Structure 1
Amino acid sequence: LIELAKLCPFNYTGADFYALCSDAMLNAMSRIARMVEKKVSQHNELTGENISTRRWFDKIATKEDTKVVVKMEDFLKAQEQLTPSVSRAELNHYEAVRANFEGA
């Protein structure tokens, strides 16, 4: 987490951090979903049983598969993809508001 704190500039907001964490979790989930898809596809041939992902989700999607695990690279890649939701001009405008509303 300290590395992420280092990378992030000083324009991030709680919404931005929430979005970043959501994207990282989504990437981890993409990994998990793809791996379950490979499980189902390969098992369709090995056993010849074309058991759609539905039956896996009901019976064969064990807790570990349901378990969500994330890696640093997910957050880092989302950070590279991350784009703040406010312009530095708007930050300066709000700083102008703060100047008159805090210095006196």
Structure 2
Amino acid sequence: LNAMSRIARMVEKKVSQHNELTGENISTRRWFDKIATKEDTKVVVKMEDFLKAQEQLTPSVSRAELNHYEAVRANFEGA
């Protein structure tokens, strides 16, 4: 999703640029349809994308202390 966001902001630049170049009335969907290329799939991804995503949101489902003490207690009481 972070990758898709970056590429998306890139094209958001592109469209604006062309709107300044060829005409401001060109629709985003029209532009992205006409100038479409096989390289549209170039959803750029890199380590920095992953690190940004990890540090940005969703640390985990259950990480802090819940897992640890249930794990140890459950193993202990299973003897």
TM-score (normalised: structure 1): 0.53
Deviation of the 1:75 alpha carbon: 0.7
Q: Deviations over 1:3-57 (max 9, x none)?
A: xxxxxxxxxxxxxxxxxxxxxxx22112111111211111112123632210133
Matched residue count: 79
Deviation of the 1:88 alpha carbon: 5.1
**Paired residue secondary structure (1:69):** coil
Report if the CA contact (8 A) 1:28-1:69 is conserved: yes
Name the % identity: 100
Which residue is equivalent to 1:60? 35
Between structures 1 and 2, the one with greater helix share = 1
Report if the CA contact (8 A) 1:28-1:70 is conserved: yes
Identify unmatched segments of 5+ residues in structure 2: none
Q: Deviations over 1:51-100 (max 9, x none)?
A: 22101332223221233121111111122224434455663466447644
Q: 2: distance between equivalents of 1:36 and 1:89?
A: 39
Instruction: Name the larger-Rg structure.
Output: 2
Which residue is equivalent to 2:67? 92
Matched, 1:80 2:55: yes
Identify unmatched segments of 5+ residues in structure 1: 1-25
Over the residues paired in the alignment, what is the CA RMSD in angstroms? 3.1
Q: 2: distance between equivalents of 1:78 and 1:97?
A: 31
Report if the CA contact (8 A) 1:29-1:68 is conserved: yes
